């Protein structure tokens, strides 16, 4: 339903979209709903797919968010993580 | 019976023994839900050397496929019947004609796609008048056997069960006749010896907090399966020979003794009023004693 | 701006005791089928009537039983009771007693004459007593309701499918109404075939009342739950339960608030009963003299 | 099945003596009139729809 | 027990969720298709005429 | 209850462990269980049996 | 003895003049009942103004086509059918339309009458091709009911009802325990002379105004199916009916000469199986 053809238009070769949707939904489930606009209805799968339709999530962009997230994980830790490693020798 | 028949529907009911027929010409002495008493010799006086015949009717029996087989009397007291005449209708038969269904008023026309691809639409009136309503009897069974861990017992006493759950069970643990049972309800209460194991420490604590104290036995009772239910119309209990028998195998037994004894009183009633009513017409001929014979005892 | 011509019940032709022809006069065209269908739809499903809902026959336990001295089996008897047409004054439940000994049919006329209860068809056969020592004694429950409410729509008693609606069949005709004025008027003729519970005019005014009322315009956790269980759930002795209820203690919350001292001071409670109550309460993690401080909320 | 039967029934050529000669004023008015009266099993009438 | 509000909860559960329907024999891949379930009274599965 | 160390130590053992008399440990066991059983907070933990 | 009446409302404005109102939880079968009653009132009993006749200068028969006008006379009448007009308090008003120039001759070019309100002034009636072209016509607008074609007895098809189309759907309603309730969804397509809601309340008002003139204790113990012994003992204690039995208490029964605990247990079980017990008060034995 949900204008799925357009969603697939956003990501060539159907299959990939599914993975993306799934991954996005997992993120949604794991921590903070957050994300892009916000129809606020029909659960994680529909929300992820609809988000994809407005090219909101994107395959590359999700990766960028994750890469930045990795840096965020770097944040905190950092000097305190360096403390745990420097203490041991 | 169908409004359009082929003319074979009587013969089918006749040859299958569900329907009850009269052996010879006669007159109906008695008609009951339970039985029909027919007095023979009405036409051609065929019965001799004692008279009359009693036909017991099958009533609310359960067939192999769980459908109810029962016969209903088609005759009335004092009615004249000939040889081969219909006495009782069996299941799925109407006045001796084969009745496999009902005669309904049908219209041939599309209806909003609800009869799409052979599907059928019906009137609520059919349910209203109980057309196409079918009676079904199901049989459930439970066994209590000797185990290495001790005997399984059929008992009203079951671990951790409220009186609400046990309400329809008799002393024995068997649901009483006439009770309405619904999915999850207990039919026969049974306890099995636990293979046993100490609970997890959290459960130890919980149990201790609510002080229920565990029991050697585990609940194995037979319950009504999902999507099933109804009215308990019979119970049968068989206990090992010379086993300790309680009220369970005594009440039903006593009932069967009362039924058998009544089954003798009715047969001796029919036989007495079947033979003496013949010896009277013989005694009168020659030695007429009208107002004299109806005084002294029958013996 | 020509105001509409409104209808009013004008004629009633009782073809029989249960079949009539009601006619609403001077209706503007097209309204024949409109009111005809609205009314036919209300009448065929929304009418209020009395119907047998339960039956208590002596000696019989399950409807599958068959009776000593009765031609038809209990099922056939209940099926006969379904067709018992009764018109009751102003009540939503009446018990009819039927005592009958003898040979022959036991009809609705044999039902004990109640002042309120009106039996539409007294010649309606309920039974057939075979032998002259046979007899039936039953209590037929008749209730007021709506539509077809089966027995499955849920004690040594039986339940019977309730066919509350008084009307069997409805038919209508549109027919051009007379009067030389305006000329373009029709008249709705509603042919009714009821069971005799309801009068034609009131059936029409009730169908109309339901219609009009449908059209009413168009506009634009803490605490333990066990505390609200009745004391009967504690499964005390009959005596203890009755005593507690006699002391206005109807729920577990009421009971756990009382103290031993207070309970023993009551006229009907002794040491035995108090011991039992403490035992059953302790068995569920409860006691007497329990503070719940906030009895109750709403 | 039925769907075809329905569509074919509503889309059928006819002498159409009963409902012929009506300008539809557009699909909407045509629909109204069709449900209304004088149109049965379609009609041989010209419609205004754009 | 089936205690009330369990139903409305079940309605909340299946929201946006889809089930697979299958009929034997499955000759091609359309022998199994996904549908959004609409809860209904009665014991029968209701199938769309076009499929 | 053996949640610690997997062994259900005796009242005398726990009492000896806390430097208190057995009566004391029985008393604090009893008030602990009392706190547990009371209607407030009872919900959740309760109804587990069936 | 009630019925489920008015509950939860929804309004889907498909546009400025097209809406979908939904009345929820109406008892099964009321969907088609109200749907058809209302569909019948709306399609014929609504009050609206409509163009019935037109007098164009130079034009005689509908077969004519005009010098300087893009569309033929038929198309012009067809345009005039869609003239949405709201008139004060009259059942007939004459509108004069004089227009010279090139371009569309819309409803806004109609001579401003004090009573007459023109709902859609941008409504195109004509299209004058050359700059020496001009139209002068007298459009008759009358008040009436339903769709009255020109063929009734220049004349133009009268769409008196302000509503163009009606549609309805029955759809199973949610609603608490009852389950087989529906909800009537009426799809309306009005012309904006009249608001959807007021059209509904006026149909309902017409309908209602049309209806304005029609507005176990006495059963023997044998029915319990106790053991022969228990029944005989109870009868021996003058306990012949269930009502007699339920009045006795355990203590009292055990004190009678022939009944023991096995039997008493039996009596409690059979009584409990029917929602009864010992020591039952009926306070009034009997009448």
Short mmCIF file of N, CA, C and O in Angstrom, two decimals, chain C residues 12-13 31 36 40 58 61 67-68 96 102 133 140 191 197 200 218 239-240 244 256 270:
data_model
loop_
_atom_site.label_atom_id
_atom_site.label_comp_id
_atom_site.label_asym_id
_atom_site.label_seq_id
_atom_site.Cartn_x
_atom_site.Cartn_y
_atom_site.Cartn_z
N UNK C 12 -57.50 1.28 10.11
CA UNK C 12 -56.96 0.02 10.61
C UNK C 12 -57.91 -1.09 10.22
O UNK C 12 -59.04 -1.15 10.70
N UNK C 13 -57.45 -1.97 9.34
CA UNK C 13 -58.26 -3.09 8.90
C UNK C 13 -57.70 -4.39 9.44
O UNK C 13 -56.76 -4.96 8.88
N UNK C 31 -42.22 9.29 -0.72
CA UNK C 31 -42.17 9.09 0.72
C UNK C 31 -42.76 7.74 1.09
O UNK C 31 -42.56 7.23 2.20
N UNK C 36 -41.92 3.48 4.12
CA UNK C 36 -42.18 2.06 4.00
C UNK C 36 -40.98 1.21 4.41
O UNK C 36 -41.12 0.23 5.13
N UNK C 40 -40.58 -0.64 7.86
CA UNK C 40 -40.43 -2.10 7.73
C UNK C 40 -39.15 -2.57 8.41
O UNK C 40 -39.10 -3.68 8.95
N UNK C 58 -40.13 -30.28 36.43
CA UNK C 58 -39.86 -31.21 37.53
C UNK C 58 -39.37 -32.57 37.06
O UNK C 58 -39.94 -33.18 36.16
N UNK C 61 -33.47 -32.66 34.34
CA UNK C 61 -32.23 -31.94 34.65
C UNK C 61 -31.61 -31.32 33.41
O UNK C 61 -31.35 -30.11 33.37
N UNK C 67 -39.11 -37.66 29.17
CA UNK C 67 -39.89 -37.84 30.38
C UNK C 67 -40.84 -39.03 30.40
O UNK C 67 -41.45 -39.39 29.39
N UNK C 68 -40.94 -39.64 31.58
CA UNK C 68 -41.83 -40.77 31.80
C UNK C 68 -43.25 -40.25 31.78
O UNK C 68 -43.69 -39.58 32.71
N UNK C 96 -44.55 -18.18 35.02
CA UNK C 96 -45.80 -18.88 34.77
C UNK C 96 -45.69 -20.29 35.31
O UNK C 96 -44.69 -20.96 35.09
N UNK C 102 -53.10 -35.96 33.62
CA UNK C 102 -54.14 -36.54 32.79
C UNK C 102 -53.59 -37.08 31.48
O UNK C 102 -52.39 -37.18 31.31
N UNK C 133 -51.53 -41.48 34.68
CA UNK C 133 -50.82 -41.24 35.93
C UNK C 133 -49.62 -40.34 35.67
O UNK C 133 -48.78 -40.12 36.55
N UNK C 140 -42.24 -21.64 33.78
CA UNK C 140 -41.81 -20.98 32.56
C UNK C 140 -41.49 -19.51 32.82
O UNK C 140 -42.37 -18.75 33.22
N UNK C 191 -49.12 -3.71 5.71
CA UNK C 191 -49.74 -4.99 6.03
C UNK C 191 -48.86 -5.69 7.06
O UNK C 191 -47.68 -5.95 6.82
N UNK C 197 -49.04 -10.00 20.19
CA UNK C 197 -48.56 -9.21 21.33
C UNK C 197 -48.83 -7.71 21.23
O UNK C 197 -49.11 -7.06 22.24
N UNK C 200 -51.53 -2.62 16.16
CA UNK C 200 -51.02 -1.98 14.94
C UNK C 200 -50.58 -0.52 15.14
O UNK C 200 -49.43 -0.18 14.83
N UNK C 218 -27.90 16.19 14.12
CA UNK C 218 -26.51 15.86 13.85
C UNK C 218 -25.66 16.99 14.42
O UNK C 218 -25.81 18.14 14.02
N UNK C 239 -22.13 -19.51 57.52
CA UNK C 239 -22.39 -18.75 58.74
C UNK C 239 -21.51 -17.52 58.87
O UNK C 239 -22.01 -16.42 59.12
N UNK C 240 -20.20 -17.70 58.72
CA UNK C 240 -19.25 -16.60 58.84
C UNK C 240 -19.51 -15.50 57.81
O UNK C 240 -19.51 -14.31 58.14
N UNK C 244 -20.67 -11.66 58.58
CA UNK C 244 -19.89 -10.53 58.11
C UNK C 244 -20.76 -9.59 57.29
O UNK C 244 -20.70 -8.37 57.47
N UNK C 256 -10.58 -6.77 56.20
CA UNK C 256 -9.20 -6.58 56.66
C UNK C 256 -9.04 -5.33 57.53
O UNK C 256 -8.02 -5.17 58.20
N UNK C 270 -18.12 -15.89 67.04
CA UNK C 270 -17.40 -16.47 68.17
C UNK C 270 -15.95 -16.77 67.85
O UNK C 270 -15.43 -16.32 66.83
#
